[PDB]
RNA sequence: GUAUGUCUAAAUGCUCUUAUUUACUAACAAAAU
RNA sequence: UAAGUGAUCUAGAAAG
C-alpha cells in the first residue's frame, strides 16, 4: 500500500489538510575556533608585551 | 567627412587616395586635414598616420605637405590659439621625427 | 507588525495553499507582504520549529557554538534545530 | 500582459486623458481667474 | 551545486586547516603592526561627517531608481524608506546604529541570475530596510580605510583612477622599472597574471570575523559576518549560506578587498609588501619606491591586485631563473618536453608577437606560477593554471604581454623592435619619466572576453525588443556602443574581431527597426532614417559600422606577423554618404592621459600663483582647460563637491553594483560626479546631418514638404503645454522622464514615408491603397494606417474635386 | 471595429444590404428595429415578417424568464416586457387583411 | 508637427482691422403654395 | 482574407459619398448603432463587493462590460462614462463612473469599494 | 492576434455640421544616462 | 627612373 501524497507546490482541488507540509560538526569547527581565539589572545598579550618594551 | 568617417588614419588616407584629386588640390586637402587636426581637443596619432601614408604614396603629396608647413610657420601660425598651436607642433614633430 | 487573527488566517491559507506559494497568501492578507509573509511563517507559524525554551545543556551547547562560530547565527540555529532570532 | 484598462480611451488613469483634463482645467481656470479679478475690482468699486 | 558545496563544508570542516588560518592571522597582525593601523571604531553619535555619509548612501540608493520609470512594490517601499531617511536624518542614523549593534538575524536574500549570454551572473537582492544600513556601512568603512591607510597603494580598483588610466599607469611603471628591457646578461622579466579563483566562494566566516576584528569594531565585524551568513532564496529552493561571502550585499566589496589584501601579503611576503607600501608616515604612490636599490633587491618588482585578478612583475637575473627552472623540474619531471603544450598563450595576438615558446622561457614562467601557487594555500583561494597567464620577457621573448581590465596589452620595447616604424593608432608610446623618451611601445587590443560581453549586451538589446519604439532601441544601441568606445577608445582600432562584431551588431540593430516595418529592403532604408538625429525625426543612431574594416591574410594573420592591407567592405551600400564614426569624436586614451598630465600641472601652477597673490582661484580663468583632464578639471569647481570628498571607495562599490542589481550600469568604469564627462558627442551629432547632405536633403526624404511649411526652422514634435504640477503620479521620473522626444514609430514611418514607401523597390507588389491614389510597394505596416487616417472620409476625391471646382 | 458589431454596421456592409434590398428584395427584419406604430406598412409581406420577428422575441423572452434564480427582479421586469410583446403581436394581427 | 481687460490696447497708434464673417453666407427661407421650403441664398 | 488586408473589394458602381448617404439613411432604422450601452472588455480597477450576493470581485478582474456616455459631462469638454459589469455569481448590474477630477472612478449603485 | 457560445416553427425626399474618436481590439512586448 | 586597375551580402507574406 502506497500513501496519498500532498504537494507543497500544488492543490488541484484546494483540499486543505492539517499541516502535512547532523548536530555533530567536524573537528575543524572546534579546532579552527581554538586556533583563532588562541591566536587572538597571543596577539593581545604579545602586543601588550611589545608596548611595555 | 572622409577624415571623420574612418577608424584608423590609414583608412582615411586610403579613402583620400581613392578620390585621386589633382596635384592642384593636394595642398588644399593637406590644409583641410591640418585644420581638422587642430579642431580635435588634443593631438591624435590618426592624423599623423594619415599624413605618413600620404607622404609615402607620392612625391606630389610630400611637396604639398612641405608647402603647407611653409605656410604655417610663415603666415598661418600666429593666428591659432595656444592648445591648437601646440597640437599642430606635435603633429609636425611626429611627421619630422621620421 | 503582525496581528493574531491575520497570523491565524495565514496559517490556514498555508494549509490550503502551500509553503512555497507566497503570492496568494500575501494577497489574502491585504497589508502584509509576500516575502514578509514567508519570513513570518518561518519565524512563528510552522509547527516543526521548536519556538519553546529548552534545558540547561542545550543552552550550554548554544553558547559553545556561539563562541566557536563567531555569531554565524543562522548556522548556529540550524545546528540547534531552533529558530534564529529566538536563539540570538 | 497585466492591467488591460491602461489600453483604453475611457480609462481616466490613462495619461493622455489626464493631460486633456488638465488642459481643460488650465484653460477654464485661467478664464475664471480673468473673470474673478474683474469681479473683485467691481466689488471694490462698489 | 552551491547548497551541495555548503553541505559538504558542514560535513567535513572548513577547507582551511586551523594551523594555516592561525598563521594567516599572525601575518595579518604583523602587517597591521608594520603599518601602525589604528583600528576602525564603531560610529559615534556625534561623529563629524556621519550625516554627510548617510546622505551619500541615500543618493547612491536613489541612483538605482532615479533612472528607471517602472518600480515593483519592494522598490517602492525602498524609495519610501529612503525618503523617510532624508526627512529625518538623525532618527534614521540612530536606527542604523541600533541595527548594527543588535541585529544578527536578517531577512532572506532572494537571487535572480542575469543572462549575460556567455555566462550567467548572480544578483543578490537584499531587503530595503537592511539595505540602507549596509550602504551606510559601506560608505563609512571605506571612508575610514581611506583616512587610515588600511589598503596599500597596490590594490587599485578601490582607487579613484579609471581602469584604462590604471592600465596606462601600470604600463608606464613597467617601462619605468630600471634596466627592465636589458637582455645582455640574461635578465629575464616574467609577468605573471591570474585570477584568484573562487576567492569570495571560499571565505570561512569565523576566520573572516577574526580578520575584521583586527581592523573594525568587533561589533561591526560581527554584524558583517552575520549579514553574509543569510538564507539565500530562489523561487522555491532556499538554503543557509553557511560558508563563503555573498557578493551582492553593499559592504561586501570592502570585505572582499580586505580578504584579497591577505592574499597579496601572502604572495609577497611581509618585508616586500612593506617596501612596496613605503613607510607608514609617508607611504608610496602606486609603483613608486623611496629608492632604486630597494626596488632592485627583491625578484618581484610591481604588484597590483585588481578585483581578485592579480598582476605580478618579476624581474630575474639569469642565475636566479636557472635555479627556479631546476626546482620546477625537480618538482615535476619533464623528459618528453610537454611544458609548451598546455601553456596559456594569448590567441588574440599573432604567433610572432605572442609569447614565444622557448624551453627556457616557458619553463621559467611555469616555475614562477608554481612558486606563486605554493605561496597561497588552495583552501584559502584556488590559483589554477587554466585561470593563469605567464608572459616572459627575455633575450628570446621581446613581447611582454598581459590582459588588464579588458585590455590586452603588448609592451614591446623599441630597442627590441626591428625598424621602429611610424606610431600607429592603438599603440601607446610608453615613456621614460627621467629622460622623457618614448622608450617603448605598447600595442592594445580589446580582450576577447570584453568583445564577448559586448556581443552579449547587443543580443540583450535586440532580444526583448519586438515592440519597442524604434527610437528606444536606437538609444539603447548608442548607449552600448558609447560604453564600448569610451571604455577602449584607442584599443578598438587594432582588434578586427571587435570591429566585425560592431558591424554585425549595428546591422542587427538596424534590422530590428526594419523588422518592425516588416521589410528590411535595403533601398527603403537609406542611412538617412537611422542616423538622422531625433531632432529631424530620425532614430539618431551613433554608427561605428561604416568603417572600412582592416582585412588581411588570415593565412598570415593568426600566424606570424601583420600589416594593414586590403580593406574589407564595412557595413552597407552607400550613396557615397560617408557617415562619420563615433571613434573620431572620442579622444584616444593616451592623448587623454597626456592632456590630464598637462592641465593638472597647469592647474597646480595657477593655484600656486593665486596663493602667491592671495586670491581664490576663479573658474573663468581655468576656462580653456575646463573639459580637459582626468578627472576633468571641472570636477574641482562643481557646486556640490564637499560631500563627494567623503565618498571614498566609490569605484569599487560601482564595480560591485553588478551583483546587487538586475540591469547594471554600462558605465561602471567611470562616474560623472567624481570624473566629469570623459566624452562629448555633440560634434558627431552636428556632423552626421552634414554627411547626410545637410538638412534640406534629409527633409526631401521625409514628408516635411507635404506638411506645407516654408522651412525647417522653429519646428518641433510633441510640444503641448507644460506639465509638472500634476506630475507626482509617476515615481523616480525626475519631474520629466526624458527631455528627448521619443518619436513613436507610427509617426516615424509617416515622417519617412516618402523614403520607406517608394517606387524603386526590389519586389514590392504595388497595391493601390483603399479610396486613394497612394501606391504601397508591399505591405508596410503602420504606414498604411497613417495614410488612411490622413485621407479619411474620401479626402483624395474631395481634394481633386475641390481643385476642379 | 473589433467585436463584430462594428463590422456588421461598417459602411460597406450597410451598402451591400441596401443593394440587396433594392435588387431581389433581401431584407433582414432581424437587423432593423420593428416599427412602433403599425398602419404605416402598406405591404403585407413586411407586416408578416415583423409579426414573425415579434413572435421570435416573445419566445426568447419566455425561454429566459423560467431561470432558477426566480426571485431576482430582472425576471419580474421581463414579465411586463413579455406582456408588452404579446400586446404588440396582437396589434400586428390587425384585420385589414 | 507644430510651428475685457485688453480693450484699451486696441486704440493705440498702431493700425488694426476688425473683421467679421457672420453675414457672409446669408439665407432666406420661405414656403411656396405647394409646400416646398425654398432656402434662397442672399447677397452677403 | 488576412487581417492586414490593404484594400477591400468594392462593386464596379460604388459612389462613395452616395453610399455613405444611403448608410446614414439606413442608420436611424438600424438596430445596432442606433442604441446605447455599447459593449466593451475591461478589468475592474476599484476591487469591490457586489451589493446583492457579496461576491468579492478583486482588482484587475476582466469583464465584458457596457460603456455608455453620461450626457452630463465633467466641467465642459471632457466626457465621463458609465461602465456596467455583472457579478460572477448573481447577475446584478454593477457599474461605475469615471469622474476625472480626482484621476479616478466613482461607484454607481452597483457595489462598494474596499 | 480583434475570442467565444446558446437563442431562430415554414413615411418620403431635403439639407446642414467638421483643423476630432461615446471609437473599438488587446492575443503582442516591456529599459536607461 | 617606378604611385593611384579591378573584388559590392542583402531584398517579403501568412499565421501566431
Ligand atoms: Mg497560440
Swiss-Prot record, chain D:
Function: Involved in pre-mRNA splicing.
Subcellular location(s) of the protein: Nucleus
Further comment: Present with 861 molecules/cell in log phase SD medium.
Sequence similarity: Belongs to the CWC25 family.
This protein's name: Pre-mRNA-splicing factor CWC25
Natural source organism: Saccharomyces cerevisiae (strain ATCC 204508 / S288c)
Coiled coil: 23-46
Subunit structure: Belongs to the CWC complex (or CEF1-associated complex), a spliceosome sub-complex reminiscent of a late-stage spliceosome composed of the U2, U5 and U6 snRNAs and at least BUD13, BUD31, BRR2, CDC40, CEF1, CLF1, CUS1, CWC2, CWC15, CWC21, CWC22, CWC23, CWC24, CWC25, CWC27, ECM2, HSH155, IST3, ISY1, LEA1, MSL1, NTC20, PRP8, PRP9, PRP11, PRP19, PRP21, PRP22, PRP45, PRP46, SLU7, SMB1, SMD1, SMD2, SMD3, SMX2, SMX3, SNT309, SNU114, SPP2, SYF1, SYF2, RSE1 and YJU2.
Residues represented out of the complete protein: 3 to 48 of 179
Curated annotation (Swiss-Prot), chain F:
Subcellular location: Cytoplasm; Nucleus
Coiled coil: none
Chain segments annotated as transmembrane: none
Superkingdom to which the source organism belongs: Eukaryota
Family statement: Belongs to the ISY1 family.
Subunit structure: Belongs to the NTC complex (or PRP19-associated complex), composed of at least CEF1, CLF1, ISY1, NTC20, SNT309, SYF1, SYF2, and PRP19.
Miscellaneous: Present with 1990 molecules/cell in log phase SD medium.
Known role: Involved in pre-mRNA splicing and cell cycle control. As a component of the NTC complex (or PRP19-associated complex), associates to the spliceosome to mediate conformational rearrangement or to stabilize the structure of the spliceosome after U4 snRNA dissociation, which leads to spliceosome maturation. The cell cycle arrest of SYF2 defective cells may be due to the inefficient splicing of TUB1. Also involved in DNA repair.
Identification of the protein by name: Pre-mRNA-splicing factor ISY1
Residues of the full protein shown: 1 to 97 of 235
UniProtKB/Swiss-Prot annotation, chain G:
Subcellular location: Nucleus
Superkingdom, taxonomy of origin: Eukaryota
Assembly information from the UniProt record: Component of the U4/U6-U5 tri-snRNP complex composed of the U4, U6 and U5 snRNAs and at least PRP3, PRP4, PRP6, PRP8, PRP18, PRP31, PRP38, SNU13, SNU23, SNU66, SNU114, SPP381, SMB1, SMD1, SMD2, SMD3, SMX2, SMX3, LSM2, LSM3, LSM4, LSM5, LSM6, LSM7, LSM8, BRR2 and DIB1.
Domain remarks: The MPN (JAB/Mov34) domain has structural similarity with deubiquitinating enzymes, but lacks the residues that would bind the catalytic metal ion.
Role: Functions as a scaffold that mediates the ordered assembly of spliceosomal proteins and snRNAs. Required for association of BRR2 with the spliceosomal U5 snRNP, and the subsequent assembly of the U4/U6-U5 tri-snRNP complex. Functions as a scaffold that positions spliceosomal U2, U5 and U6 snRNAs at splice sites on pre-mRNA substrates, so that splicing can occur. Interacts with both the 5' and the 3' splice site, as well as the branch region. Has a role in branch site-3' splice site selection. Associates with the branch site-3' splice 3'-exon region. Also has a role in cell cycle.
Note: Present with 468 molecules/cell in log phase SD medium.
Protein name in the entry: Pre-mRNA-splicing factor 8
Gene: PRP8
Part of the whole protein covered: 1825 to 1877 of 2413
UniProtKB/Swiss-Prot annotation, chain H:
Cystine crosslinks: none
Keyword terms of this UniProt record: Metal-binding, mRNA processing, mRNA splicing, Nucleus, Spliceosome, Zinc
GO function terms (MF aspect): metal ion binding; U2 snRNA binding
Coiled coil start-end: none
Gene Ontology CC annotations of this record: nucleus; Prp19 complex; U2-type catalytic step 1 spliceosome; U2-type catalytic step 2 spliceosome
Induction: Expressed in exponential-phase cells grown in rich medium.
Localization (cell): Nucleus
The organism's place on the tree of life at top rank: Eukaryota
Major localization listed first in the record, in broad terms: nucleus
Binding site for Zn(2+): 50, 53, 87, 90
GO terms, biological process: generation of catalytic spliceosome for first transesterification step; generation of catalytic spliceosome for second transesterification step; mRNA splicing, via spliceosome; RNA splicing
Subunit field text: Component of the spliceosome. Present in the activated B complex, the catalytically activated B* complex which catalyzes the branching, the catalytic step 1 C complex catalyzing the exon ligation, and the postcatalytic P complex containing the ligated exons (mRNA) and the excised lariat intron. Interacts (via C-terminus) with CLF1. Interacts (via N-terminus) with SYF1. Interacts with U2 snRNA; this interaction is direct.
Family to which the UniProt record says this protein belongs: Belongs to the CWC16 family. YJU2 subfamily.
Further information: Present with 2250 molecules/cell in log phase SD medium.
Protein's recorded name: Splicing factor YJU2
Organism: Saccharomyces cerevisiae (strain ATCC 204508 / S288c) (Baker's yeast)
Taxonomic classification: Eukaryota, Fungi, Dikarya, Ascomycota, Saccharomycotina
Residues represented out of the complete protein: 2 to 115 of 278
